[PDB]
């Protein structure tokens, strides 16, 4: 069985789909037309891929309306491949089997179904090989498209939708993919796909052609009868001419295209051809037949998302190793310039500069954290509609294994290198306080980065906004301008500065109990005014409280900012347009 039907389809975004009828039988059903037509807009309507606000038709499966879980029981092959190139083919479709299936069955059954899919599709030669990223090379385009096809074949879908499987391929593997689809349909399985500029070498395989032009249906019926249909309409197909291009030239309306026939008689272009089809025998025959008629837990889908993200992170040691190496080099260089901090007139300047630069670098290094939910937006949307997981599990999995371990490490590397090569304060607690403050600054900057770019499609706009925001945050830090000289109507802006919160904590940690005047006991009293001989005087002059609360409130503020920004990012992901 598994026969799809759609009656009186009308979609309004500007009505983009006029009255469209059709029955897709088990076979190889193709949708053809120009790019601006309803060719692509009808595939996403037949599958639950568009918002039902504008759909005014009636679509049925075996004469009954489709259930709620129709998207979970019907594969959809996205045009652009969303396979992760870092994982292998077997691991990619193993990840798919582990989420899209049920957890009642053991791993042996999931694995044997995986084996059956890769054998049926013919993916045994490159079963255990990497797909291939842009830097490292793996399998070629045909087998990548085949892997993407097999990703949704795991749950043996009854109906399979494909969005232009030929586009982005070449003239050699396109026929291989089409023959694979035909062989799969020979057992009997509805396969509906969009096609762009086919060849006659693949046209003979179609069993039901659907021609669309500007939302108007222009032909529907057997694919082998279309050429005769358009021949009997007064359009001759020249010898050695592609029937698909022959149809498209009529649809577009090129005068230099095929010539007319001879007329024996006894609405510019688009409303005459459709009207011809309305009063045709195919329309009556179609209308008579038309009128005759979660699964996985939260943890189970958190572990798998986190594992896939970790494998993706480790698969290309080029984004983590690069920043690790640059952090190691920067720490050594900084320790080289600032070697041997002295307790003299120049000690305060050096300490302030080295503590400010570390915080500024920790803040500015999180700008590159917008490649977390931007480069994977399409894949996330596809797997959310398909029913892999929910937003919370994806958000936490991409957080535990992508942002948590790649932000903590640079702070540790910086702190264990620059500290003793400088000689800030030889105490056990100060070292850990500095490391903790750097970790919080990095985490806060990364969380704000995520909150800004949480559903955008490009990075050229989020990065500029974040850079311009961090510049203003750096202005209100405490070194470039004295925070006690600000006007009352502008001093409040300092409370929205992450670098200020980090820098204040670092300074309060470093400058407590230091004398900066050789041979002057200013601890008792200061015999000379305008002296700033003692570290406490510098802290008070900078507007910093001397109580331990004046240190820990910085971390309290940083944690509050972390929570607010993470919640904002999760809400932005939750209310994303999923269609």
């Amino acid at each position: 069985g598994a026969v799809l039907s759609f009656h009186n389809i009308c979609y309004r975004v500007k009505e983009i789909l006029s009255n469209i009828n059709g029955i897709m039988k088990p076979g190889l059903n193709a949708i053809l037309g120009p790019t601006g037509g309803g060719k692509s807009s009808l595939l996403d309507v037949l599958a639950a891929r568009k918002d039902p606000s504008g759909l005014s038709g009636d679509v049925l499966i075996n004469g009954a309306p489709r259930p709620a879980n129709f998207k979970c029981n019907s594969g959809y092959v996205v045009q652009d491949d969303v396979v992760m190139g870092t994982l292998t083919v077997r691991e990619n479709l193993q990840f798919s089997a582990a989420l899209r299936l049920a957890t009642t069955m053991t791993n042996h059954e999931k694995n044997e179904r995986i084996n059956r899919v890769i054998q049926e599709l013919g993916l045994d030669k490159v079963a255990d090989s990497k797909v291939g990223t842009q830097f490292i090379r793996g399998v070629s385009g045909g087998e990548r498209k085949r892997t993407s096809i097999g990703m949704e074949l795991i749950t043996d879908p009854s109906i399979l939708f494909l969005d232009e499987p030929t586009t982005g391929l070449d003239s050699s593997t396109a026929n291989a993919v089409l023959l694979l689809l035909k062989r799969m349909s020979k057992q009997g399985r509805t396969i509906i796909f969009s096609i762009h500029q086919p060849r006659y070498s693949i046209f003979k395989l179609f069993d039901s052609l659907t021609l669309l032009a500007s939302g108007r249906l222009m032909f529907h019926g057997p694919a082998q009868e279309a050429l005769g249909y358009f021949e009997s309409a007064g359009y001759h197909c020249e010898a050695y001419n592609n029937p698909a291009d022959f149809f498209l030239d009529i649809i577009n309306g090129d005068s230099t295209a095929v010539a007319l026939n001879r007329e024996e008689d006894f609405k510019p272009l688009i409303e005459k051809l459709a009207e011809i089809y309305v009063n045709s025998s195919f329309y009556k025959e179609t209308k008579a037949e038309l009128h005759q008629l979660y699964t996985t837990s939260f943890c189970h889908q958190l572990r798998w998302v986190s594992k896939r993200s970790f494998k993706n992170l480790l698969g290309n040691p080029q984004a983590s190793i690069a920043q690790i190496i640059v952090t190691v080099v920067l720490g050594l260089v900084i320790g080289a310039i600032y070697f041997g901090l002295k307790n003299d007139s120049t000690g305060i300047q050096n300490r302030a500069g080295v503590l400010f630069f570390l915080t500024t670098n920790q803040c500015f290094s999180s700008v590159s954290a917008v490649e977390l939910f931007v480069v994977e937006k399409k894949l996330f949307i596809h797997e959310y509609i398909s029913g892999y997981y929910r937003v919370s599990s994806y958000f936490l999995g991409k957080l535990l294994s992508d942002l948590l371990p790649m932000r903590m490490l640079p702070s540790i590397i910086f702190t264990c290198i620059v500290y003793f090569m400088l000689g800030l304060k030889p105490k056990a607690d100060a070292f850990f306080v500095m490391m903790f403050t750097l970790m919080m600054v990095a985490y806060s900057a990364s969380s704000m980065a995520l909150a800004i770019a949480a559903g955008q499609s490009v990075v050229s706009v989020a990065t500029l906004l974040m850079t311009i925001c961090f510049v203003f945050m750096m202005i209100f830090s405490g070194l470039l301008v004295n925070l006690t000289t600000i006007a009352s109507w502008l001093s409040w802006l300092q409370y929205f500065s992450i670098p200020r919160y980090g820098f204040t904590a670092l300074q309060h940690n470093e400058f407590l109990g230091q004398n900066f005047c050789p041979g002057l006991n200013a601890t008792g009293n200061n015999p000379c005014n305008y002296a700033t001989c003692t570290g406490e005087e510098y802290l008070v002059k900078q507007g910093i409280d001397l109580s331990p609360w004046g240190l820990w409130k910085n971390h309290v503020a940083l944690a509050c900012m972390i929570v607010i920004f993470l919640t904002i990012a999760y809400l932005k992901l939750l209310f994303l347009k999923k269609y």
Partner: nanobody, 122 residues
Framework: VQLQESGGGLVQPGGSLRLSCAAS????????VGWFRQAPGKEREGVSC????????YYPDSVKGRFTISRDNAKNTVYLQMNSLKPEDTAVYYC?????????????????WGQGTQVTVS
């Protein structure tokens, strides 16, 4: 994919001859065929029609005697019989088709496909 027709060359007038309008590639059951007549020196005039749902219809001018019609879907063809004398002789007899559902054949267009046969009458 092409639409051909076959006839014959009659020697003595008054005989009965059957022309066939065959089409290959596409089935004719979805279409309505029309037999048109042209001669080297006259104008273009049709003979009659065929309906895809009901029976046959006839809208001729002076040829209203023994012209029968038959559409055979098993062989995917239609036929034209001639029995009467019919002093009109040696016509090309083109054969066209068009796809409509409504009645009143004579209001269609009948786009033609190919060249025709030729008959002889003494």
């Amino acid at each position: 994919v092409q639409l051909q027709e076959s006839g014959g060359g009659l020697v003595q007038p008054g005989g009965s001859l059957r022309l066939s309008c065959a089409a290959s590639g596409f089935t004719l059951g979805y279409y309505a065929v029309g037999w048109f007549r042209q001669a080297p020196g006259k104008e273009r005039e049709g003979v009659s029609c065929i309906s895809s749902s009901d029976g046959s219809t006839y809208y001729p001018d002076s040829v209203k005697g023994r012209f029968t019609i038959s559409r055979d879907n098993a062989k995917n063809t239609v036929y034209l019989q001639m029995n009467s004398l019919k002093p009109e002789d040696t016509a090309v007899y083109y054969c066209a088709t068009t796809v409509r559902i409504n009645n009143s054949c004579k209001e269609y267009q009948y786009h033609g496909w190919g060249q025709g046969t030729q008959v002889t009458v003494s």
